Design a protein around this nucleic acid. Structure first.
Ligand SMILES: [Mg+2]
Ligand SMILES: [Mg+2]
Ligand SMILES: [Mg+2]
Ligand SMILES: [Mg+2]
Ligand SMILES: [Mg+2]
Ligand SMILES: [Mg+2]
Ligand SMILES: [Mg+2]
Ligand SMILES: [Mg+2]
Ligand SMILES: [Mg+2]
Ligand SMILES: [Mg+2]
Ligand SMILES: [Mg+2]
Ligand SMILES: [Mg+2]
Ligand SMILES: [Mg+2]
Ligand SMILES: [Mg+2]
Ligand SMILES: [Mg+2]
Ligand SMILES: [Mg+2]
Ligand SMILES: [Mg+2]
Ligand SMILES: [Mg+2]
Ligand SMILES: [Mg+2]
Ligand SMILES: [Mg+2]
Ligand SMILES: [Mg+2]
Ligand SMILES: [Mg+2]
Ligand SMILES: [Mg+2]
Ligand SMILES: [Mg+2]
Ligand SMILES: [Mg+2]
Lengths: 151, 127, 98, 61, 79, 206
RNA sequence: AAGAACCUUACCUGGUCUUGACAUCCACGGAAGUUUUCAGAGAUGAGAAUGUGCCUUCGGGAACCGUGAGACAGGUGCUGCAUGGCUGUCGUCAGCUCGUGUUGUGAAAUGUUGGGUUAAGUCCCGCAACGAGCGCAACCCUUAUCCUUUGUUGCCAGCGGUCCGGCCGGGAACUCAAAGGAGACUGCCAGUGAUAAACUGGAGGAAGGUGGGGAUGACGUCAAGUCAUCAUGGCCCUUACGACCAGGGCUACACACGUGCUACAAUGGCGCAUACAAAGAGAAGCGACCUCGCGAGAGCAAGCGGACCUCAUAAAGUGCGUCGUAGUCCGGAUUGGAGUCUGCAACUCGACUCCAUGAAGUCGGAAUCGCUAGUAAUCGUGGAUCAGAAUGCCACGGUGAAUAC
């Protein structure tokens, strides 16, 4: 907005696992307003990732999200002239949501078998740092530190 | 003894009859687990009788009509929340912090003239 | 036994008609269950407003048909037949049936 | 068919409901008509706003 | 093909079929009724069908069974 | 006008309907037609009596009309002779037995329908609109109105181009549903065309 | 335009009429109406019939029909730049004004500006102004909690007989239905603030800050739209720009644009099983069940002018199996054959069904659109117009987000 402060309530924690981040991930991954399909797909991918990596269930995806989160983002700014890519500081929640969106879109663009396996593959290659989410992730880091004096 | 709670959410009226004993949940003269509980309100119906006490402490008999999956889920949750008068209202102090006592007044907004659903305004050409 | 239904458009006129009916029925006899609310019909209309083009300009109207039901199982007939024909029903629709 | 019974169409084809248009009663408009009040959009509103039609009120549900 | 389970034929047109058959083909008969159905009772006959301004003659054949009288009357005019 | 009609937006608040008859969809349209026809006939014959409003109700299988006027003498005259003919003719047109009643409304200048007609009558007799309308205003307030508003539109004074002129005095809250506003219009047929008159009268807040 | 196959319908071509299709004054004749026949596309002319009744002052009227004269009737003909009425937009933005008073020779100014605050010309303080009006809020409807009355055609907590179905004794607790009330008002506290307005937070509370939504549209602008809804000034036609009928046309088609529906698929398609809703209509109407048909449908045909009966077994959803990434079991246009059904009439030109064929389309350039919470997104149901017609309009519910630094 422009005058009134806003803030959204907190979605319910993810069923059984109780992961608020996982509940937010199903929100982002949701399509056409169908939580059942999103929940089934996320659980299938989560168990596949856990059994493939030999890691636990809760933090197996936490590692990938930690390793695919950025630090600064370029904001199109033009005070006197044309557009300047001015990098800025990323808020905590904004960083988390941006990494989550990156993972979801990276899984979207794949074609391996189906969402259940594509999400697991994205998580694995994000843990390893050889995926496409990470490939897009390093771009902001390389484009940072361009124009500081401007604001 | 018997204890009653109404429960409502999106034109989904429930009826919850809590009582002592160590029985199971019964919704619409039938088991919730038989009625697809693992995804239908998997952990919505059994919210209020988790935080304050254990599930296997009070028998009950629920029956809800009108609404949908989440409609029945929220209606039964609200009814159970307002159906825990086992000992005074000391538990409502804790349930207030969790926010389960208040219902969800949010409802489907009517369809306006000149719009498609409620706020989808038909696109116009040129300006 | 004898069930009576009254229809009108106003909510208080039907209330006073039902009050008159029940008062006369209890005076002349007994066994009155009182009026029953029952659903109320909402006849909804919408009409274009401008005499030419201007499709968006519309007006919404609604008619509230209120309905009341009261039944009596009085044994004696000389009370019900006397109750009939003496009441104007506050000038709204009313029907007699068994 | 059964014999020449169908051919008995010597009627002026006016009694058939298809011939009647069911226009308005005060002025007469082919369009903007409703069965309930028997008038047409425009006229109806005049009566409703002037308070002639019983039980008609603005809808604000 | 469609339209119930039986054909339809006009009566003031059905008055001409019997005369045409009894007296043989004499000349195409000018008419307006674009409703009658080519019934076998017409091989070897010519009929003039109205289109609005002029009555176009048309000769009936053996393979016009499921085709109506007005069918062979082009009302759309093109460059 | 772009303003919602005061006599239509308060029907369920402080403005009783002019028709209080019930009927199913089978004969609703026929009842409407009969009411409109009887009103149109009656208002032409009773033009001199200056009828304010005509209410129609359905007694037990019959038609009952009540007409409120400020000159009951014309419609009543000697005994009920002048109402007997009106009753029989309205019964003829309605197809059912009829009963017509006369109501007296004193202080006619406080009535909207009536104030307008005055104006229109005057205009039709080539009177200066400005003053026709100013008297209306004064008259009313003298009588006690908490407010009055008058408007006239058309080819005022036979001008080549139409113009709208209004006078507002006192308090006329049109957005307050609690208040009762007696609103009415009226037309004139002058040699230059049709002139519209529109009067609001604010009597009380409830 | 909330329903162009006839009509609708004015427009085109043909065939007809001239006091007329319709109102009214006059004369003569004739009950109305019901049945058929000749010609003709029909309108239409041209015959035979049947009928010849109420009031009836016995020279006729009232209901109605045919013929004739003249006043007339008629016009969807022109002018929205003569108009009434009605409507769109700036814009539900907060502004627009009037009394006295004062200032200026005057047009005018003031107030209505300033310091704070608010969604607000909302409120407080100051002030050469003091008051008021239209407008904002508030009165209205709907929705979210509770209470009183009432308890069937609705409901079943405690009990009973229970083909163990709320179905039958009964009861009315409860859902629910509809009448009347309570409640939310910055009200109680803390802090900030010129101590005021107000702001931030907390408690309580179902609902905290005009709670959500609707109705409500100021003075005026656009010679904005409508002479076609209707009315109406002026002009024009009146042996035709009036009236009747058949057919045709409004549905054309080398192109362009607007608004939508269905798709490009695996968050899917198909088969089996199987869940959970609200709001409406119904008498030339809704049309159970049963029988026939692979089908649209047909026969029988109860019930229902309605919490009873019917339309009417909501789809998404979830439980199993198949397809495994392709122009495909995706996709459905086009087209051929065969059918169902409304209607005097489906050919110009209707809807639906069965069999067969299976184009384009694998996310879309410049550019551009809607949406901040039950919102968007997506999934079903109903209603008006209407004999027969929706992807349009109006309206109800299920699932249900992301982001606002
Ligand atoms: Mg539109
Ligand atoms: Mg919806
Ligand atoms: Mg029709
Ligand atoms: Mg006319
Ligand atoms: Mg036509
Ligand atoms: Mg204009
Ligand atoms: Mg001076
Ligand atoms: Mg100002
Ligand atoms: Mg000023
Ligand atoms: Mg200020
Ligand atoms: Mg103010
Ligand atoms: Mg029992
Ligand atoms: Mg609070
Ligand atoms: Mg308001
Ligand atoms: Mg408006
Ligand atoms: Mg113009
Ligand atoms: Mg124009
Ligand atoms: Mg024609
Ligand atoms: Mg067209
Ligand atoms: Mg398929
Ligand atoms: Mg229907
Ligand atoms: Mg109903
Ligand atoms: Mg096929
Ligand atoms: Mg493909
Ligand atoms: Mg239809």
């Amino acid at each position: 907005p422009r005058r009134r402060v806003i803030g959204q309530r907190k979605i319910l924690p993810d069923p059984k696992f109780g992961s608020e981040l996982l509940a937010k991930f199903v929100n982002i991954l949701m399509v056409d307003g169908k939580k059942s399909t999103a929940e089934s797909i996320v659980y299938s991918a989560l168990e596949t990732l856990a059994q493939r990596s030999g890691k636990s269930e809760l933090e197996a995806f936490e590692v990938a999200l930690e390793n695919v989160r950025p630090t600064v983002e370029v904001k199109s700014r033009r005070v006197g002239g044309s557009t300047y890519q001015v990098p800025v500081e990323v808020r905590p929640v904004r960083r988390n949501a941006l990494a989550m969106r990156w993972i979801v879109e990276a899984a979207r663009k794949r074609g391996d078998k189906s969402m259940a396996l594509r999400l697991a593959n994205e998580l694995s290659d994000a843990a390893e740092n050889k995926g496409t989410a990470v490939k897009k992730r390093e771009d902001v880091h390389r484009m940072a530190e361009a124009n500081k004096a401007f604001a | 003894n018997q204890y009653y709670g109404t429960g409502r959410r999106k034109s989904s009226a429930a009826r919850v009859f809590i009582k002592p004993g160590n029985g199971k949940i019964v919704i619409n003269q039938r088991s919730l687990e038989q009625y697809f509980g693992r995804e239908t309100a998997r952990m919505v119906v059994r919210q209020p009788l988790e935080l304050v006490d254990m599930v296997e402490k009070l028998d009950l008999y629920i029956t809800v009509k009108g609404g949908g999956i989440s409609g029945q889920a929220g209606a039964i949750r609200h009814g159970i929340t307002r159906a825990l008068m086992e000992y005074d209202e000391s538990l409502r102090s804790e349930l207030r912090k969790a926010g389960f006592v208040t219902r969800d007044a949010r409802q489907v907004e009517r369809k306006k003239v000149g719009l498609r659903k409620a706020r989808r305004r038909p696109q116009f050409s040129k300006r | 036994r004898i069930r009576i239904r009254l229809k009108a458009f106003d909510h208080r006129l039907i209330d006073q008609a039902t009050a008159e009916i029940v008062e006369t029925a209890k005076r002349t006899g007994a066994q009155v269950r009182g009026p029953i609310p029952l659903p109320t019909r909402k006849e909804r209309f919408t009409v274009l407003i401008s005499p030419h083009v201007n499709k968006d300009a519309r007006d919404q109207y609604e008619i509230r048909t209120h309905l009341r039901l009261v039944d009596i199982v009085e044994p004696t007939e000389k009370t019900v037949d006397a109750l009939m024909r003496l009441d104007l029903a506050a000038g709204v629709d009313v029907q007699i049936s068994l | 068919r059964w014999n020449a019974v169908l051919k008995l169409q010597t009627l002026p084809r006016d009694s058939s409901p298809s011939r009647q248009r069911n226009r308005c009663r005060q002025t007469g408009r082919p369009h903007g008509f409703l069965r309930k009040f028997g008038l047409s959009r425009i006229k109806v509103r005049e009566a409703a706003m002037r308070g002639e039609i019983p039980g008609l009120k603005k809808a604000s549900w | 093909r469609s339209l119930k389970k039986g054909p339809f034929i006009d009566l003031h047109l059905l008055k001409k079929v019997e005369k045409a058959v009894e007296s043989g083909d004499k000349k195409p008969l000018r008419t307006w009724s674009r409703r009658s159905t080519i019934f076998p009772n017409m091989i070897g006959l010519t009929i003039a069908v109205h289109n609005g301004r002029q009555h176009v003659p048309v000769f009936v054949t053996d393979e016009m069974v499921g085709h109506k009288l007005g069918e062979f009357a082009p009302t759309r005019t093109y460059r | 006008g772009q303003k919602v009609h005061p006599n239509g937006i308060r029907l369920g608040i402080v403005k009783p309907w002019n028709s209080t008859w019930f009927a199913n969809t089978k004969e609703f349209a026929d009842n409407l037609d009969s009411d409109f026809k009887v009103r149109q006939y009656l208002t032409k014959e009773l033009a001199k009596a200056s009828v304010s409003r005509i209410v129609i109700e359905r007694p037990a299988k019959s038609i009952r009309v009540t007409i409120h006027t400020a000159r009951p003498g014309i419609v009543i005259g000697k005994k009920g002779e002048d109402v007997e003919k009106l009753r029989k003719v309205v019964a003829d047109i309605a197809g059912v037995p009829a009963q017509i009643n006369i109501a007296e409304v004193r202080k006619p200048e406080l009535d909207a329908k009536l104030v307008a007609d005055s104006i229109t009558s005057q205009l039709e007799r080539r009177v200066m609109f400005r003053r026709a309308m100013k008297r209306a205003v004064q008259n009313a307030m003298r009588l006690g109105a908490k407010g009055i508003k008058v408007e006239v539109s058309g080819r005022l004074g036979g001008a080549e181009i139409a113009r709208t002129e209004w006078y507002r005095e006192g308090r006329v809250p049109l957005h307050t549903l609690r208040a009762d506003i007696d609103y009415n219009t009226s037309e004139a047929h002058t040699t230059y065309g049709v002139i519209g008159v529109k009067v609001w009268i604010f009597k009380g807040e409830i």
